[PDB]
Amino acid sequence: SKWLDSLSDSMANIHTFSACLALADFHGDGEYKLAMGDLGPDGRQPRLKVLKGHTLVSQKPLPDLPAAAVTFLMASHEPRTPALAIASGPCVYVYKNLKPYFKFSLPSLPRRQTVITTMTTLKKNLADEDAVSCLVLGTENKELLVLDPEAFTILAKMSLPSVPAFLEASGQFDVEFRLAAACRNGSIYILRRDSKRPKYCIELGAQPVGLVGVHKVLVVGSNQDSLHGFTYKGKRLWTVQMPAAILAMNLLEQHSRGLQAVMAALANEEVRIYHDKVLLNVIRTPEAVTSLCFGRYGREDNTLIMTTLGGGLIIKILKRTAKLNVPRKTRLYVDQTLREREAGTAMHRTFQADLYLLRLRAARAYVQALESSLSPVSREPLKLHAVVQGLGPTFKLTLHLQNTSTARPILGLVVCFLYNEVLYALPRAFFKVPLLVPGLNYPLETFVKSLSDKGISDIIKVLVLREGQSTPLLSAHINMPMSEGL
Amino acid sequence: FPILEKQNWLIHLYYIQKDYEACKAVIKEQLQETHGLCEYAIYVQALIFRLEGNIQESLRLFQMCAFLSPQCADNLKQVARSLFLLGKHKAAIEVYNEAAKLNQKDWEICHNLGVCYIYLKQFDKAQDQLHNALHLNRHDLTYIMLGKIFLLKGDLDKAIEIYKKAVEFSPENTELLTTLGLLYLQLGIYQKAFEHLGNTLTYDPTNYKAILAAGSMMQTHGDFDVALTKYKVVACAVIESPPLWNNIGMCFFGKKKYVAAISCLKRANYLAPLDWKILYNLGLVHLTMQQYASAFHFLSAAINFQPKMGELYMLLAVALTNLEDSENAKRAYEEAVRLDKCNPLVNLNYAVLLYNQGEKRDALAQYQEMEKKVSSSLEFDPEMVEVAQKL
């Protein structure tokens, strides 16, 4: 019981994602808020909502659906709150103190513009709590825009072979930057210095559903319900299997114990924190969880806020004090085996005689059937069987006919019915059949009608035959049921 | 005039979390707004269809996505894949070719051309294409398909190298380990086979396809109780499988539990009446049990299912010798000696039949045939020397 529970609510309709939800300081004074660009209850109404404590303080409409929302310090002159750069359409709304401060536009393409999907930050030179961070945008057009500290000009333009979906930025931009991009084609591409093209790609076999960067290992969550830890050079070092699907992966980092472990929001109503290979601090939820965030929310260095697939919020504060069925045989079996051991010769001889007589009678009946042509299955490939449907004086009689050959149609065939003209009134007791294409079951149906006022069940024969021959190619029989007339 | 792909990220995020319900609604909304030309509300919708059983609407929508982007190798790849998911492999090849003349640097086209030419029995082109697929980017499935080619076409002499090179890297795949162990069983090596089967069993303890072969190998070198425990490990997972019960019946026949072996063998035969191994085993056990009327029946069945065997006719002749039919035993032994090459037991048993028939002339011929053929059985050794000295 390492995870001290703080709040569990279900009326909060917060359908955010694990990437458009970030917590940071927004008015100084060491009081961290959590800003999230939440969609509609379905995805129709983009609304930016910020949370302080566990009561909603401000939700306000947004032009379009936010694709990402990450905070960063734009400059070190008297450091106020970081700026919240929320990505929407081809635009980046930069909010200062949760107020509309700037609207960066993306430089268009020769009009055919693009949309930004993934957004993270990158460190310039210091990489501390007061350092200046620069944006990195992933356009829908397969491009990565490394922006400026103040979100107005481009510092770099990187070319990627497929649309990115997830991004990870490690290091400092000027001298040592590593940009991992999980694309839609199911691949991770890493971007280093001097390389406009990655040239170090790794395929996952399935589309990556998450991307979290540990200081040395990079985890990739697969659509196959697992995690795969790779190295920053392009060589997998481990892989762990999940019991259910992976909905969202984030990072849980506490500097007191130096624990930087990847999370996992599984679809089986649980969340398991994963270090290099071991599981620990697995939790439960009343419903599977779609987004998890771990940081200094409120005033605790170990807050973890999680949103249920159905809405609601669950905030948890981490304490600092972390044989076989072989059958049986009875007397009958041993007596039978004794009889067989004492009289095996007579049994052998009489069974061989019976088999000879059975072959004789089976050949006899087969020849008699060939004579009468009564086989519904019989070079010259065909197969027909007649189904009767319906009670009452009128029955639907559908002949399922089929050509069974590699590729050869049967042109001239015709069906003729044989019935008792005093009991059944067949409208068309003879009709041509369509060109039978090899492999298709043709249902050819007719309406039989019982005429006898008393219930009389009489057989009906069906003969399928060529038009130049008089011997039926094959035949079928149907015992017509009782009439249930009036 | 609105932006074409406004919500491709949201559709991708709904599809990648295995929703297929909200993703479909967003797809429909986007398409209704854009009147088509989205190229990613059709693509993801077709992929969703393909995830369901349907591979027809997936093909239609991939056709539409190819029509929208005529020069886009991935769309042609997806259309050829939707073909290959159906039975049409020639058309799949002819679409993969166009997908390749737009991109000559991907392994997927070559791997899929390999697996298509495999279904088309063109082994030269398949082999070369899969070699290419390795050289571009080595993947496990390409190694598996190449091993399958080298097994279907020729001998394991060509497959052992490929499977060893495959398991060399990424050695945690159970399929590769188990198939290499099986191919070691197929040859004389029984040690490295055990090594790789144990390597598999460390990862997956309850692997049925590996437990079966491990128990088989164990039964071969005596110690039937260890194989019986191996089978107890997986008995409940596969409670009705003819091979498992046949191996269990042979286990119980090893340690002289003939009735509890007839039981398992008859149960396995009921669940697979066309499997010659169970019929041969039933015949052998009914010979050992001295019944001689069911032994002939089951051995004749196993003959009618695999007639080009030598031991089957030997055992049928041994059953006919005790059925007061010696001429049929003569002709069955002739069939066997003609159809057997490397088993002296047939020759020794025919020599015994001849010597018991009072001939003593052709018994020497069968003894010399056996001694030309030749060595471990304890009781075939003595009759070897007793029919020698008494002849």
PDB file of N, CA and C in Angstrom, chain A residues 151-202:
ATOM      1  N   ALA A 151       8.893  31.360 -29.321  1.00  0.00           N
ATOM      2  CA  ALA A 151       7.858  30.865 -30.231  1.00  0.00           C
ATOM      3  C   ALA A 151       7.518  31.881 -31.321  1.00  0.00           C
ATOM      4  N   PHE A 152       8.550  32.389 -31.999  1.00  0.00           N
ATOM      5  CA  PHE A 152       8.303  33.219 -33.176  1.00  0.00           C
ATOM      6  C   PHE A 152       9.170  32.896 -34.387  1.00  0.00           C
ATOM      7  N   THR A 153      10.330  32.256 -34.238  1.00  0.00           N
ATOM      8  CA  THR A 153      11.175  31.950 -35.384  1.00  0.00           C
ATOM      9  C   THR A 153      11.668  30.514 -35.296  1.00  0.00           C
ATOM     10  N   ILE A 154      12.134  30.007 -36.432  1.00  0.00           N
ATOM     11  CA  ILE A 154      12.578  28.624 -36.551  1.00  0.00           C
ATOM     12  C   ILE A 154      14.084  28.562 -36.339  1.00  0.00           C
ATOM     13  N   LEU A 155      14.527  27.614 -35.516  1.00  0.00           N
ATOM     14  CA  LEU A 155      15.948  27.337 -35.353  1.00  0.00           C
ATOM     15  C   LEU A 155      16.426  26.159 -36.184  1.00  0.00           C
ATOM     16  N   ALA A 156      15.563  25.185 -36.452  1.00  0.00           N
ATOM     17  CA  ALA A 156      15.981  24.055 -37.271  1.00  0.00           C
ATOM     18  C   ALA A 156      14.768  23.410 -37.924  1.00  0.00           C
ATOM     19  N   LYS A 157      15.005  22.779 -39.073  1.00  0.00           N
ATOM     20  CA  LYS A 157      13.976  22.055 -39.809  1.00  0.00           C
ATOM     21  C   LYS A 157      14.512  20.676 -40.156  1.00  0.00           C
ATOM     22  N   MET A 158      13.907  19.642 -39.577  1.00  0.00           N
ATOM     23  CA  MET A 158      14.359  18.267 -39.724  1.00  0.00           C
ATOM     24  C   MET A 158      13.360  17.489 -40.567  1.00  0.00           C
ATOM     25  N   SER A 159      13.871  16.653 -41.467  1.00  0.00           N
ATOM     26  CA  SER A 159      13.037  15.888 -42.385  1.00  0.00           C
ATOM     27  C   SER A 159      12.893  14.456 -41.885  1.00  0.00           C
ATOM     28  N   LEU A 160      11.648  14.004 -41.758  1.00  0.00           N
ATOM     29  CA  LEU A 160      11.300  12.680 -41.281  1.00  0.00           C
ATOM     30  C   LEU A 160      10.553  11.927 -42.379  1.00  0.00           C
ATOM     31  N   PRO A 161      10.690  10.600 -42.469  1.00  0.00           N
ATOM     32  CA  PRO A 161      10.034   9.879 -43.572  1.00  0.00           C
ATOM     33  C   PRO A 161       8.550   9.619 -43.374  1.00  0.00           C
ATOM     34  N   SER A 162       8.020   9.747 -42.161  1.00  0.00           N
ATOM     35  CA  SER A 162       6.604   9.512 -41.918  1.00  0.00           C
ATOM     36  C   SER A 162       6.119  10.446 -40.820  1.00  0.00           C
ATOM     37  N   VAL A 163       4.807  10.653 -40.784  1.00  0.00           N
ATOM     38  CA  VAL A 163       4.188  11.573 -39.832  1.00  0.00           C
ATOM     39  C   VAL A 163       4.497  11.126 -38.409  1.00  0.00           C
ATOM     40  N   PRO A 164       5.112  11.971 -37.586  1.00  0.00           N
ATOM     41  CA  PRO A 164       5.359  11.590 -36.194  1.00  0.00           C
ATOM     42  C   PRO A 164       4.071  11.561 -35.392  1.00  0.00           C
ATOM     43  N   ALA A 165       4.084  10.764 -34.325  1.00  0.00           N
ATOM     44  CA  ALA A 165       2.932  10.668 -33.440  1.00  0.00           C
ATOM     45  C   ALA A 165       3.343  10.954 -32.003  1.00  0.00           C
ATOM     46  N   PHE A 166       4.565  10.570 -31.645  1.00  0.00           N
ATOM     47  CA  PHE A 166       5.081  10.796 -30.303  1.00  0.00           C
ATOM     48  C   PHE A 166       6.507  11.318 -30.399  1.00  0.00           C
ATOM     49  N   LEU A 167       6.893  12.159 -29.444  1.00  0.00           N
ATOM     50  CA  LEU A 167       8.209  12.783 -29.467  1.00  0.00           C
ATOM     51  C   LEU A 167       8.869  12.706 -28.099  1.00  0.00           C
ATOM     52  N   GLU A 168      10.198  12.639 -28.117  1.00  0.00           N
ATOM     53  CA  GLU A 168      11.016  12.643 -26.913  1.00  0.00           C
ATOM     54  C   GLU A 168      12.270  13.449 -27.205  1.00  0.00           C
ATOM     55  N   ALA A 169      12.573  14.418 -26.345  1.00  0.00           N
ATOM     56  CA  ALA A 169      13.724  15.298 -26.525  1.00  0.00           C
ATOM     57  C   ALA A 169      14.656  15.132 -25.333  1.00  0.00           C
ATOM     58  N   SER A 170      15.882  14.693 -25.594  1.00  0.00           N
ATOM     59  CA  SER A 170      16.876  14.472 -24.554  1.00  0.00           C
ATOM     60  C   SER A 170      18.087  15.365 -24.782  1.00  0.00           C
ATOM     61  N   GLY A 171      18.573  15.968 -23.706  1.00  0.00           N
ATOM     62  CA  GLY A 171      19.801  16.732 -23.740  1.00  0.00           C
ATOM     63  C   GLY A 171      19.583  18.223 -23.906  1.00  0.00           C
ATOM     64  N   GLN A 172      20.638  18.880 -24.379  1.00  0.00           N
ATOM     65  CA  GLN A 172      20.637  20.312 -24.637  1.00  0.00           C
ATOM     66  C   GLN A 172      20.809  20.555 -26.129  1.00  0.00           C
ATOM     67  N   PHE A 173      20.034  21.511 -26.646  1.00  0.00           N
ATOM     68  CA  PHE A 173      19.850  21.637 -28.090  1.00  0.00           C
ATOM     69  C   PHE A 173      21.147  22.004 -28.798  1.00  0.00           C
ATOM     70  N   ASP A 174      21.945  22.888 -28.198  1.00  0.00           N
ATOM     71  CA  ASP A 174      23.079  23.451 -28.922  1.00  0.00           C
ATOM     72  C   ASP A 174      24.134  22.397 -29.234  1.00  0.00           C
ATOM     73  N   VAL A 175      24.467  21.547 -28.265  1.00  0.00           N
ATOM     74  CA  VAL A 175      25.625  20.676 -28.371  1.00  0.00           C
ATOM     75  C   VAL A 175      25.240  19.199 -28.405  1.00  0.00           C
ATOM     76  N   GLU A 176      24.231  18.779 -27.633  1.00  0.00           N
ATOM     77  CA  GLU A 176      23.882  17.356 -27.585  1.00  0.00           C
ATOM     78  C   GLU A 176      22.366  17.224 -27.491  1.00  0.00           C
ATOM     79  N   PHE A 177      21.708  17.060 -28.634  1.00  0.00           N
ATOM     80  CA  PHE A 177      20.272  16.833 -28.669  1.00  0.00           C
ATOM     81  C   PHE A 177      19.980  15.469 -29.276  1.00  0.00           C
ATOM     82  N   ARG A 178      19.012  14.767 -28.690  1.00  0.00           N
ATOM     83  CA  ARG A 178      18.526  13.496 -29.211  1.00  0.00           C
ATOM     84  C   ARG A 178      17.013  13.583 -29.320  1.00  0.00           C
ATOM     85  N   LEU A 179      16.492  13.459 -30.537  1.00  0.00           N
ATOM     86  CA  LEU A 179      15.057  13.577 -30.777  1.00  0.00           C
ATOM     87  C   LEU A 179      14.518  12.241 -31.267  1.00  0.00           C
ATOM     88  N   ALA A 180      13.777  11.547 -30.411  1.00  0.00           N
ATOM     89  CA  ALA A 180      13.137  10.294 -30.780  1.00  0.00           C
ATOM     90  C   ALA A 180      11.710  10.570 -31.231  1.00  0.00           C
ATOM     91  N   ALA A 181      11.354  10.053 -32.402  1.00  0.00           N
ATOM     92  CA  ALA A 181      10.055  10.292 -33.018  1.00  0.00           C
ATOM     93  C   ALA A 181       9.410   8.948 -33.325  1.00  0.00           C
ATOM     94  N   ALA A 182       8.293   8.670 -32.660  1.00  0.00           N
ATOM     95  CA  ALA A 182       7.454   7.519 -32.962  1.00  0.00           C
ATOM     96  C   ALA A 182       6.441   7.931 -34.019  1.00  0.00           C
ATOM     97  N   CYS A 183       6.524   7.314 -35.196  1.00  0.00           N
ATOM     98  CA  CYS A 183       5.699   7.708 -36.325  1.00  0.00           C
ATOM     99  C   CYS A 183       4.483   6.794 -36.456  1.00  0.00           C
ATOM    100  N   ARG A 184       3.700   7.028 -37.511  1.00  0.00           N
ATOM    101  CA  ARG A 184       2.510   6.223 -37.749  1.00  0.00           C
ATOM    102  C   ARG A 184       2.843   4.903 -38.427  1.00  0.00           C
ATOM    103  N   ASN A 185       3.955   4.842 -39.151  1.00  0.00           N
ATOM    104  CA  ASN A 185       4.372   3.620 -39.824  1.00  0.00           C
ATOM    105  C   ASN A 185       4.992   2.607 -38.874  1.00  0.00           C
ATOM    106  N   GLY A 186       4.866   2.818 -37.567  1.00  0.00           N
ATOM    107  CA  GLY A 186       5.406   1.892 -36.594  1.00  0.00           C
ATOM    108  C   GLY A 186       6.918   1.885 -36.565  1.00  0.00           C
ATOM    109  N   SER A 187       7.523   3.035 -36.282  1.00  0.00           N
ATOM    110  CA  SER A 187       8.974   3.116 -36.236  1.00  0.00           C
ATOM    111  C   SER A 187       9.392   4.280 -35.351  1.00  0.00           C
ATOM    112  N   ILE A 188      10.563   4.124 -34.739  1.00  0.00           N
ATOM    113  CA  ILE A 188      11.200   5.162 -33.943  1.00  0.00           C
ATOM    114  C   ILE A 188      12.397   5.656 -34.740  1.00  0.00           C
ATOM    115  N   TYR A 189      12.455   6.962 -34.973  1.00  0.00           N
ATOM    116  CA  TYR A 189      13.586   7.589 -35.643  1.00  0.00           C
ATOM    117  C   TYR A 189      14.271   8.530 -34.666  1.00  0.00           C
ATOM    118  N   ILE A 190      15.596   8.461 -34.593  1.00  0.00           N
ATOM    119  CA  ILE A 190      16.365   9.305 -33.687  1.00  0.00           C
ATOM    120  C   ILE A 190      17.101  10.353 -34.511  1.00  0.00           C
ATOM    121  N   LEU A 191      17.099  11.583 -34.012  1.00  0.00           N
ATOM    122  CA  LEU A 191      17.703  12.726 -34.677  1.00  0.00           C
ATOM    123  C   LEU A 191      18.821  13.260 -33.793  1.00  0.00           C
ATOM    124  N   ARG A 192      20.028  13.333 -34.349  1.00  0.00           N
ATOM    125  CA  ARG A 192      21.213  13.833 -33.671  1.00  0.00           C
ATOM    126  C   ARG A 192      21.766  15.034 -34.436  1.00  0.00           C
ATOM    127  N   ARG A 193      22.918  15.523 -33.983  1.00  0.00           N
ATOM    128  CA  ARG A 193      23.542  16.682 -34.605  1.00  0.00           C
ATOM    129  C   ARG A 193      23.957  16.371 -36.038  1.00  0.00           C
ATOM    130  N   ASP A 194      23.891  17.396 -36.890  1.00  0.00           N
ATOM    131  CA  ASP A 194      24.381  17.403 -38.265  1.00  0.00           C
ATOM    132  C   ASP A 194      23.558  16.507 -39.188  1.00  0.00           C
ATOM    133  N   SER A 195      22.581  15.771 -38.667  1.00  0.00           N
ATOM    134  CA  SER A 195      21.809  14.816 -39.455  1.00  0.00           C
ATOM    135  C   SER A 195      20.431  15.399 -39.740  1.00  0.00           C
ATOM    136  N   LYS A 196      20.234  15.886 -40.968  1.00  0.00           N
ATOM    137  CA  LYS A 196      18.899  16.301 -41.384  1.00  0.00           C
ATOM    138  C   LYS A 196      17.966  15.104 -41.512  1.00  0.00           C
ATOM    139  N   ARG A 197      18.511  13.936 -41.848  1.00  0.00           N
ATOM    140  CA  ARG A 197      17.814  12.665 -41.884  1.00  0.00           C
ATOM    141  C   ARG A 197      18.282  11.784 -40.732  1.00  0.00           C
ATOM    142  N   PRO A 198      17.382  11.006 -40.125  1.00  0.00           N
ATOM    143  CA  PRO A 198      17.761  10.201 -38.953  1.00  0.00           C
ATOM    144  C   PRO A 198      18.902   9.233 -39.219  1.00  0.00           C
ATOM    145  N   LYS A 199      18.719   8.342 -40.191  1.00  0.00           N
ATOM    146  CA  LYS A 199      19.664   7.289 -40.560  1.00  0.00           C
ATOM    147  C   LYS A 199      19.933   6.303 -39.426  1.00  0.00           C
ATOM    148  N   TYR A 200      19.201   6.399 -38.317  1.00  0.00           N
ATOM    149  CA  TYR A 200      19.222   5.395 -37.252  1.00  0.00           C
ATOM    150  C   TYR A 200      17.764   5.143 -36.883  1.00  0.00           C
ATOM    151  N   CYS A 201      17.131   4.208 -37.579  1.00  0.00           N
ATOM    152  CA  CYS A 201      15.728   3.889 -37.370  1.00  0.00           C
ATOM    153  C   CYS A 201      15.594   2.514 -36.732  1.00  0.00           C
ATOM    154  N   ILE A 202      14.513   2.328 -35.977  1.00  0.00           N
ATOM    155  CA  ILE A 202      14.198   1.037 -35.375  1.00  0.00           C
ATOM    156  C   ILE A 202      12.714   0.754 -35.558  1.00  0.00           C
TER     157      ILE A 202
END
